Amino acid sequence: RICFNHQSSQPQTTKTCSPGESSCYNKQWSDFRGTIIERGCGCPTVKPGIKLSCCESEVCNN
């Protein structure tokens, strides 16, 4: 599995996930700084007030 791992609108970067990892994630939240979009490997645990979208296909978390 290969996922995008860049933040919000910075230039696109990818990451090779560790063996057996099948998902990619896209997290989104706002803080005092702005609207943040985090991307990477896996499907992390759902935490209050943060939007989480998980997908299982190559570079699916744009």
From Swiss-Prot:
Changing residue 21 to A: No change in potency of inhibition of Torpedo marmorata acetylcholine receptor. Its main location: secreted. Changing residue 49 to V: 2.4-fold decrease in potency of inhibition of Torpedo marmorata acetylcholine receptor. Changing residue 28 to A: 1.35-fold decrease in potency of inhibition of Torpedo marmorata acetylcholine receptor. Changing residue 9 to G: 8.8-fold decrease in potency of inhibition of Torpedo marmorata acetylcholine receptor. The record marks 7, 29, 31, 36, 38, 47 as: Very important residue for binding to acetylcholine receptor. It comes from the Eukaryota. Expressed by the venom gland. Changing residue 25 to A: 3.7-fold decrease in potency of inhibition of Torpedo marmorata acetylcholine receptor. Keywords: Acetylcholine receptor inhibiting toxin, Disulfide bond, Ion channel impairing toxin, Neurotoxin, Postsynaptic neurotoxin, Secreted, Signal, Toxin. Residues 43-54 are annotated as: Loop III. Changing residue 10 to A: 210-fold decrease in potency of inhibition of Torpedo marmorata acetylcholine receptor. Changing residue 11 to N: 2.2-fold decrease in potency of inhibition of Torpedo marmorata acetylcholine receptor. Changing residue 5 to V: 1.4-fold decrease in potency of inhibition of Torpedo marmorata acetylcholine receptor. Changing residue 16 to A: 2-fold decrease in potency of inhibition of Torpedo marmorata acetylcholine receptor. Changing residue 38 to K: 7.8-fold decrease in potency of inhibition of Torpedo marmorata acetylcholine receptor. Binds with high affinity to muscular nicotinic acetylcholine receptors (nAChRs) (tested on Torpedo marmorata, Kd=21 uM) and with low affinity to neuronal alpha-7/CHRNA7 nAChRs (tested on chimeric alpha-7/CHRNA7, Kd=0.07 nM) and inhibits acetylcholine from binding to the receptor, thereby impairing neuromuscular transmission. Blocks the extracellular increase of dopamine evoked by nicotine at 4.2 uM concentrations. In vivo, produces peripheral paralysis. This is Erabutoxin a. It comes from Laticauda semifasciata. The chain holds residues 22 to 83 of 83 of the full protein.
